[PDB]
Ligand binder design. Structure first.
Ligand SMILES: CCCCCCCCCCCCCCCCCC(=O)OC[C@H](COP(=O)([O-])OCC(O)COP(=O)([O-])OC[C@@H](COC(=O)CCCCCCCCCCCCCCCCC)OC(=O)CCCCCCCCCCCCCCCCC)OC(=O)CCCCCCCCCCCCCCCCC
Ligand SMILES: CCCCCCCCCCCCCCCCCC(=O)OC[C@H](COP(=O)([O-])OCC(O)COP(=O)([O-])OC[C@@H](COC(=O)CCCCCCCCCCCCCCCCC)OC(=O)CCCCCCCCCCCCCCCCC)OC(=O)CCCCCCCCCCCCCCCCC
Ligand SMILES: CCCCCCCCCCCCCCCCCC(=O)OC[C@H](COP(=O)(O)O)OC(=O)CCCCCCCCCCCCCCCCC
Ligand SMILES: CCCCCCCCCCCCCCCCCC(=O)OC[C@H](COP(=O)(O)O)OC(=O)CCCCCCCCCCCCCCCCC
Ligand code: HEC
Ligand code: HEC
Ligand code: HEC
Ligand code: HEC
Ligand SMILES: COC1=C(OC)C(=O)C(C/C=C(\C)CC/C=C(/C)CC/C=C(\C)CC/C=C(\C)CCC=C(C)C)=C(C)C1=O
Ligand SMILES: COC1=C(OC)C(=O)C(C/C=C(\C)CC/C=C(/C)CC/C=C(\C)CC/C=C(\C)CCC=C(C)C)=C(C)C1=O
Ligand SMILES: COC1=C(OC)C(=O)C(C/C=C(\C)CC/C=C(/C)CC/C=C(\C)CC/C=C(\C)CCC=C(C)C)=C(C)C1=O
Ligand SMILES: COC1=C(OC)C(=O)C(C/C=C(\C)CC/C=C(\C)CC/C=C(\C)CC/C=C(/C)CCC=C(C)C)=C(C)C1=O
Lengths: 50, 59, 376, 122, 70, 52, 48, 376, 48
């Protein structure tokens, strides 16, 4: 189904509409409390050992 | 960065029925180590004042 | 509505005023409200009693006597609390027999039956350890005989026994801990009763016809308040007769003797509501097998919603078999107050065998035959 | 009282402007407004005024509250470029709420109640 | 369960793709100073009132004890 | 007489040392498990059209 | 809020207050409490 | 899906596992779980102590000593109970001060505040009658001084005093009835706590921002279980320190003397958590006026959700006056422990007057001015 | 009609019964309770 008839968005180049039509792969999280690992880091987490 | 090993994961972590007895033996040894450290520190600090020190002194 | 604006009034209205109840319930559906009234009466009388009772040896008997003769209204309080246990057990037993007759534990009311069986076990433990508290001969020797039955479990026997006693025999630590356990257990009884009533309200009650009654439901708070009040007044009449005219009829005269650990009475029997289990235990000539049979009775009680087929009338074979079961249980109650004799041992063994036969063979198999006859 | 109550109003206005300056400095770090500090659960007139609003105003109010609650969880404030753009005193609710309260005061002088109650859950 | 009209994009990362307590050492002095900056006035007025009234009361009690002497 | 008022002071202090050590280690472990569970929320990214 | 906010918002008017007949009939419950206490305690020489 | 099949799983899941909670709650929202844990700790250690305590004036102190020395782990249980009472009062007082700071009693949470004030009154009575049970000098003489406040009521004062005592003085019937009431009132506290918590779950908690939080809610069980565990471990550290290193720090040395009705101590003082009420009572040189002032304090606490305007951080004048109120109640706590003196009488009178001024004048009027400042 | 009624009607087939792997995974909980009891009691070198 079409998103205009189902989600019924507002029209315009708003910040939410830009990510809705084309999401970016360069997602920035907040890093004030936790610094992320490098993306694609594999392996079973060390937190189980802790 | 630091990451738990896969071969060590498949043995002691994937099933709870293997994880729990390992947890109990680790708990036993942790209690033994804490008991040893506390008792050694207390007996070293208060040497010559306990009753056993007087009894071993009278031998 | 005024009850729609305060959440306390909404719950009370929903579960006590406007709760839809079948309109054809007879007077054998008043067992539960009577049991709740007896629980509340026991709690009130006991909390009043505990203000004059001292839970120590060499003071317990004298404190009960001071309660009886010197506390204003103390004799009424003691006799009410003593006979209220008997009336509580009468009402709860008739409630259980109603549920046995109508098949009340079946789907979807299995949780109601299971919580009832748990309540019954807690009631038994509460009544026993409360019977120890006056510290007479019957109290001491019944507590001795029952608690020294943990020497049937292999290896871990007398360890559990001595940990229960707080020593090597029933003494002051046993009485002192029995006071605390007995004070505490009725609040667990009240909480389990609230949970038990809340489990029934999910699906509502059965009816004497044994059919679906969703088409004919009426409000609880108007129609079944006065109907419960009538039965409560009958129970109050019996209670007043027992307190004021025959206060020591249901008891034992040996419990008016102070406890002597070096002299035992001739006949050691419990209160009447424990007598059927005592007869089951005393009939089997092995302690571990007697404890196993006592545990098996309650296990078969727990398994009843999942093995029991067959209800009240229109299921007539199981209906007739219910009366043999009732006679068997009453016979076991009579046998527990007698002495050990080869004929009484044989009759008690036959009664225990028939009790297990009815609970485990008649209820599934005869019920399945009735279903195959009626709807096959 | 009327002789001293003629000039008691500019002192009230000065204290009100100082109060709004301090609180709006506190509010702007969370991205909030003064009208966002009114709870429909706390007041039934505010609950009535909020359903008289167009949907985009309600969507904006919910977005601002969500951003402020996220900032409060993270123990953060807005960045400087967002913080310089904040308008804590731009009203969206005061006209509608004033009309609602005037209607309720009008109904009460004639013995009538308000045509709404508190929000009741469950 | 209380429908809320809202327009957003939300992103969340796995808790095994970031660190747990390493940033806690960096932010600890800043959080200490921020806490005292935010609650400085209330703690100070509490301390001033409590210790001033207690000190005045204890001083006058000591003077009362001295006045009873001969 | 000080022994007579508190006859188990030595045993109480040994148990208190063990308890304080154990609880102090467990505080760090519980803080670790609290921060691990709350990490996807403390680092989430919300983007909306509101500027104000 | 409902207690003093309603007085301050001007929602408590004479037309919204209960009537004097309502206050008379509600306040008649005070004699019921007095006679209930006298029935419970019976602390009288009133019977003569 | 599995919790959809049983009622008890569904209620537990809804109210403990998947209950929505504001995501920005800080560590000031941990006082309720800590208070519940301290109530459970008090109930467990009290039930365990009741198996060795004897409620008689000839055996109470001696059984306390025997439990201290001879019962295995009895010293840990007795110190845990006596200091867990103080930690219970610390956690509850901080919980109430959180509610006073944020104005959490306001609409639609008036029922939560009122049930809280009821809980606090029951808690005060429970602790006061529990302190009499060791039957020391403070235990006897504080019960004598406090229950003698009933004679401030004219005509029927001495009759109520003698009815509560069971005699002409504080003696053995007082101790026995106090033991029964003390065993009983914690279960009423548990019921009141269940009702109090179920009242809050109707609307949810408030947040530190003081705004509506329905847009940002997360599950209680996954997130706030660990956050409550952290605070429970910080409380367990303080509990361990108080039990093992400083067990008589928060006590009184005179309660280790056996009770003597013919020689009063020089300084009769309560436990620290009743010292502000005692200072309010001692500051006024009239017994009836002091009792009335205490009753008016608790009436002002009941009337907080209907006269109180003004909440958290963004309402800054009342936020500043909160710290003056906190300094006033701690000054009342300190003044109760000191002897009667003209300057302490004057300072206590001024502190009581400021407490009344803050409760009845600042909270309505200053709250209304700041609402007019912010939204007028 | 949960229990013996399910097996009288023929609703308990060889299928809908637990597998051998399911019973082994459930049966592996037998060692956990044994180890937990031995951890709680600690009867060291008590095996005859
Ligand atoms: C010492 C001096 C005393 C006075 C200063 C008090 C502390 C200074 C900082 C204050 C502060 O803001 O505290 C939070 C502060 C940082 O907070 P934040 O990151 O801004 O925000 C997080 C929230 O505030 C906190 O929320 P959260 O839930 O995310 O964090 C929980 C946890 C944060 O978790 C931790 O990192 C704490 C670790 C505990 C240590 C236990 C170690 C023993 C066992 C080790 C096992 C750990 C396993 C991990 C191993 C894997 C590692 C790879 O914090 C705690 O519960 C620890 C105590 C924090 C303060 C409590 C006392 C306040 C009143 C002051 C009384 C003193 C007088 O955390 C710490 O204090 C921990 C770091 C240690 C500071 C030492 C100096 C560093 C330079
Ligand atoms: C103190 C009471 C609060 C304890 C909170 C329970 C909990 O989540 O376990 C933490 C904690 C377990 O330690 P942990 O290894 O850090 O937590 C397990 C994983 O981190 C994460 O384990 P999880 O996410 O699977 O935990 C879910 C939790 C189920 O959590 C809930 O639904 C919590 C319901 C009650 C909340 C109590 C708040 C007060 O079920 C459990 O695994 C523990 C059930 C015992 C409750 O509980 C304990 O056994 C500590 C002593 C508390 C007693
Ligand atoms: C005669 C008997 C002698 C007894 C001697 C011992 C008395 C008690 C020990 C000395 C106490 C004095 C210093 C206390 C410092 C505590 C810390 C503190 O205040 O910081 C909180 C607080 C900390 O704020 P935060 O770090 O933001 O929490 O500090 C302040 O805000 C400053 C407080 C100053 C106000 C109190 C000053 C002393 C009052 C004395 C009044 C005397 C009146 C004389 C009138 C009669 C004259 C004829
Ligand atoms: C809503 C109503 C709120 C009412 C608020 C009431 C007060 C609440 C907070 C009270 C703070 C605790 C004070 C207790 C001692 C008072 C003693 C007193 O005034 O008399 C002196 C009293 C008698 O002095 P004298 O009669 O003048 O010679 O002295 C004592 O009895 C010794 C005092 C020992 C003080 C110990 C202080 C540290 C204990 C542990 C602190 C824990 C803090 C929180 C940690 C846990 C967090 C969860
Ligand atoms: C404040 C709340 C509080 C609660 C809740 C509470 N107690 Fe206590 N209890 C006390 C205090 C205070 C004492 C006096 C301790 C002391 O000074 O020795 C005490 C003492 C006792 C004593 C006398 C033994 C002794 O050490 O003096 C018994 C018995 C007792 N409590 C039983 C119970 C029981 C049973 C419960 C719950 C079912 C309970 N308590 C709950 C406060 C409480
Ligand atoms: C072993 C079984 C059992 C015991 C013991 C038991 N209940 Fe019942 N109770 C039931 C069952 C089954 C029902 C449902 C009966 C029906 O609806 O056909 C029931 C129904 C009730 C009802 C609804 C009215 C009625 O009597 O049908 C009440 C009230 C009630 N129980 C209370 C109690 C209380 C209070 C106690 C004990 C203190 C108690 N029950 C003990 C099994 C039990
Ligand atoms: C299911 C039964 C039952 C319940 C419920 C019950 N009791 Fe009793 N209790 C007994 C029996 C039986 C006795 C023995 C009475 C006797 O023979 O004198 C007893 C004895 C006592 C005694 C000893 C004094 C005496 O006269 O025997 C006290 C005290 C007491 N109970 C308190 C309580 C309290 C307190 C509660 C509830 C909070 C309670 N009981 C609830 C059955 C019960
Ligand atoms: C006089 C006030 C008062 C007392 C005493 C009180 N409560 Fe609270 N409590 C509140 C209020 C108000 C709230 C709602 C605060 C909020 O959610 O912002 C609350 C909230 C709670 C919460 C939810 C989270 C929290 O900590 O705020 C719990 C749990 C709780 N109370 C338990 C208890 C228990 C257990 C006791 C005592 C045995 C108790 N309360 C005593 C007033 C009180
Ligand atoms: C003359 O002799 C006899 C008695 O005597 C007067 C009796 O009564 C009984 C009746 C007792 C029976 C059938 C057994 C009672 C049931 C149990 C489980 C035994 C009681 C167990 C105890 C006391 C263990 C300690 C536990 C306590 C106190 C409470 C536990 C706490 C909780 C569950 C929360 C019989 C048969 C008897 O021949
Ligand atoms: C967001 O807000 C909320 C919290 O805050 C963060 C909470 O923490 C909790 C969880 C509440 C807790 C831990 C408080 C404990 C609750 C109560 C009602 C305390 C009283 C209960 C007692 C003392 C139980 C003890 C009695 C028993 C077991 C009965 C006797 C029977 C036996 C001994 C067998 C909830 C639901 C919550 O929504
Ligand atoms: C060392 O000692 C002392 C205490 O102790 C630790 C005290 O606290 C206090 C002072 C405490 C005050 C003023 C606050 C607490 C006040 C009261 C009145 C406590 C309430 C208790 C009462 C009235 C006793 C009556 C008991 C009843 C009614 C039982 C409850 C049962 C039912 C309602 C059914 C003092 C002076 C004291 O020197
Ligand atoms: C099949 O249809 C049904 C019936 O059959 C017609 C019933 O009978 C009932 C249940 C009947 C009830 C609940 C009333 C009986 C009373 C009970 C269980 C409790 C007895 C309590 C009394 C007499 C008063 C107690 C007083 C106090 C003050 C204790 C409370 C304590 C505090 C507030 C602190 C139900 C639900 C039903 O569906």
């Amino acid at each position: 189904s079409d998103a205009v008839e189902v989600f019924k968005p507002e029209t315009g180049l708003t910040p939410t509409n830009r990510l809705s039509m084309a999401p970016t792969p360069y997602i920035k999280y907040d890093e004030h409390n936790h610094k992320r690992f490098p993306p694609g880091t594999e392996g079973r987490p060390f937190a189980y050992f802790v | 960065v630091m990451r738990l090993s896969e071969a060590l994961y498949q043995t002691f972590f994937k099933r709870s029925t293997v994880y729990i007895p390992m947890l109990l033996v680790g708990a036993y040894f942790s209690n033994e180590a804490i008991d040893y450290a506390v008792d050694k520190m207390w007996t070293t600090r208060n040497k010559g004042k306990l009753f056993s020190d007087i009894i071993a002194e009278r031998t | 509505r005024m009850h729609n604006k305060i959440q306390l009034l909404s719950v009370l209205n929903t579960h006590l005023v406007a709760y839809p109840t079948p309109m054809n319930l007879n007077y054998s559906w008043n067992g539960g409200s009577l049991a709740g009234m007896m629980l509340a009466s026991q709690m009130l009388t006991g909390i009043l009693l505990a203000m004059h009772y001292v839970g120590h040896v060499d003071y317990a008997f004298a404190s009960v006597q001071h309660l009886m003769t010197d506390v204003p209204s103390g004799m009424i309080l003691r006799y009410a609390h003593a006979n209220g246990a008997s009336l509580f057990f009468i009402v709860v037993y008739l409630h259980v027999l109603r549920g046995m007759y109508y098949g009340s534990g079946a789907q979807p009311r299995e949780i109601v039956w299971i919580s009832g069986v748990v309540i019954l076990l807690v009631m038994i433990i509460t009544a026993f350890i409360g019977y120890v508290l006056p510290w007479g001969q019957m109290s001491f020797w019944g507590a001795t005989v029952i608690t020294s039955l943990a020497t049937a479990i292999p290896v871990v026997g007398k360890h559990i026994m001595y940990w229960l006693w707080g020593g090597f025999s029933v003494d002051n630590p046993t009485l002192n801990r029995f006071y605390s356990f007995h004070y505490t257990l009725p609040f667990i009884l009240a909480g389990l009763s609230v949970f038990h009533i809340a489990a029934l309200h999910q699906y509502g009650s059965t009816n004497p016809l044994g059919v679906n009654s969703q088409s004919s439901l009426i409000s609880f708070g108007s129609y079944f308040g006065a109907k419960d009040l009538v039965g409560a007044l009958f129970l109050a009449l019996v209670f007043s007769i027992l307190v004021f005219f025959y206060p020591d009829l249901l008891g034992h005269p040996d419990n008016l003797i102070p406890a002597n650990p070096y002299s035992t009475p001739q006949h050691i029997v419990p209160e009447w509501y424990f007598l059927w289990v005592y007869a089951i235990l005393r009939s089997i000539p092995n302690k571990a097998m007697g404890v196993l049979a006592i545990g098996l009775v309650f296990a078969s009680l727990f398994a009843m919603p999942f093995i029991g087929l067959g209800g009240g009338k229109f299921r007539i074979i199981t209906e007739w078999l219910y009366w043999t079961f009732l006679a068997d249980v009453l016979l076991l109650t009579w046998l527990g107050g007698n002495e050990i004799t080869p004929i009484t041992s044989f009759v008690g063994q036959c009664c225990t065998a028939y009790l297990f036969f009815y609970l485990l063979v008649c209820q599934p198999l005869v019920g399945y035959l009735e279903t195959q006859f009626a709807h096959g | 009282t009327s002789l001293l109550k003629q000039v008691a109003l500019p002192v009230f206005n000065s204290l009100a402007t100082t109060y709004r300056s301090v609180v709006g400095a506190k509010l702007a770090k969370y991205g909030l407004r003064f009208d966002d500090l009114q709870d429909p659960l706390k007041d039934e007139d505010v609950a009535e005024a909020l359903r008289r609003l167009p949907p985009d105003v309600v969507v904006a109010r919910n977005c601002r509250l969500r951003r402020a609650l996220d900032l409060s969880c993270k123990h953060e404030a807005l960045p400087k470029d967002l913080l310089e753009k904040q308008t804590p005193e731009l009203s969206y609710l005061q006209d509608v709420l004033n009309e609602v309260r005037a209607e309720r005061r009008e109904r009460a002088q004639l013995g009538a109640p308000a045509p709404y109650t508190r929000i009741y859950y469950d | 369960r209380q429908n809320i009209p809202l327009r957003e994009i939300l992103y969340q990362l796995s808790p095994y793709q970031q660190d747990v307590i390493r940033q806690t050492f960096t932010n600890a002095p800043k959080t200490f100073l921020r806490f005292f900056k935010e609650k400085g006035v209330g703690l100070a007025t509490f301390g001033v009132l409590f210790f001033g009234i207690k000190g005045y009361t204890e001083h006058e009690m000591h003077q009362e004890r001295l006045a009873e002497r001969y | 007489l000080a022994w007579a008022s508190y006859p188990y002071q030595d045993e109480m202090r040994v148990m208190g040392i063990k308890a304080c050590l154990m609880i102090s280690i467990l505080i760090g472990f519980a803080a670790y498990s609290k921060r691990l569970r709350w990490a996807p929320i403390k680092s989430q990214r919300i983007v909306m059209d509101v500027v104000n | 809020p409902i207690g003093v906010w309603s007085v301050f918002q001007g929602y408590v008017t004479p037309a919204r207050l209960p009537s004097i007949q309502t206050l008379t009939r509600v306040g008649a419950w005070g004699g019921v409490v007095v006679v209930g206490g006298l029935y419970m305690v019976q602390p009288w020489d009133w019977l003569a």
